[PDB]
Amino acid sequence: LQYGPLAFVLGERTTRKLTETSKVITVDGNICSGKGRLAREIAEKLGLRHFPEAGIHYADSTTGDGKPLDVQLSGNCSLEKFYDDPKSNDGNSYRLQSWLYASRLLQYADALEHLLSTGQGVVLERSIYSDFVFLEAMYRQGFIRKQCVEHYNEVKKVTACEYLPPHVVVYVDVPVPEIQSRIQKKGNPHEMKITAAYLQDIENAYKKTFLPEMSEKCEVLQYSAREAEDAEKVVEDIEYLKCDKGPWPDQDDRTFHRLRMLVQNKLEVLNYTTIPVYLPEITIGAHQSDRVFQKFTELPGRKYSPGYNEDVGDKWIWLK
């Protein structure tokens, strides 16, 4: 049965499933750092569910078939062209940033739902509390306008306040020259154009805003470049953490009920992402919106509800 007030009235309580390994974990770091590998090793060692960093096509991976859709029908933004022309006059940069924030919000909702439904811990790469640093890096470099920052702040203020911050924040420090060396040795021809000022802005935003304000909610585990490959030592450091200072211990059954009703029903999660603030970078005309929506509705498994599309092999429709 679908979770709701009825399941809460008789039986279901979230507090009982929490077994000292709930522990929402995020592993933050600058561009091209080995935060992903550390996250996978932490999840493997502690037996938690690992969530790869949410990209442009994260929402596609969870609906219908997990394969991504066309960029015209999903995202409508490019990271490659953001690297090529960060100061483009078609609003690609802030469109990408807003879409990425929406994707991160959806991923955080999914992780919270899984944790509250099964009691198993989760490990995320970045979070909605960390996305803003990239926005800041876009603003100092002149890639986006100030109105875009105001719109981002409005959306974040109305959205991110409804959830619980992660239990423990893991941050990996890599100096900018080493990051540039890693980028040069990588080979992706679009990331060679990342100037050192952009990475310096990202690191400045991280170390000056995110870590201080996140440390007030809960302690932060910082690791240099060399002491992140030893994932066993990192896990054993995480395990002996005294987590009794954040909002998490102050959560009872009814608050968990509210949060669990919030995390499912993804439309309510994404409600305030499309607020009617008309920025040229994200506002789309009526003709283009109509054409793109008609294009989207013609996809093989999208015209009807999930179980009612006979063109992808749905049977017994006339009795469902």
């Binding site: 109305v158 305030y272 607020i275 009617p276 008309y278 005309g285 009526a286 003709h287």
Partner: protein, 54 residues
């Protein structure tokens, strides 16, 4: 060559707090997107008491 449809300028007529703005209501602001006003810093001062010496 195609049908006219509303644009941002047309849509912005309906985004204010009231229709037909006047001089008095030009400073009314629309409610927050969620119905949550930001908390005012109405600090309450505690009582200061002398305990002793007498």
């Amino acid at each position: 060559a195609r049908q006219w449809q509303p644009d941002v300028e047309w849509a912005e007529q309906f985004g204010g707090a009231v229709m037909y703005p006047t001089k008095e209501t030009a400073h009314w602001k629309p409610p927050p997107w969620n119905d949550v006003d930001p908390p005012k810093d109405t600090l309450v001062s505690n009582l200061t008491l002398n305990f002793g010496p007498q």
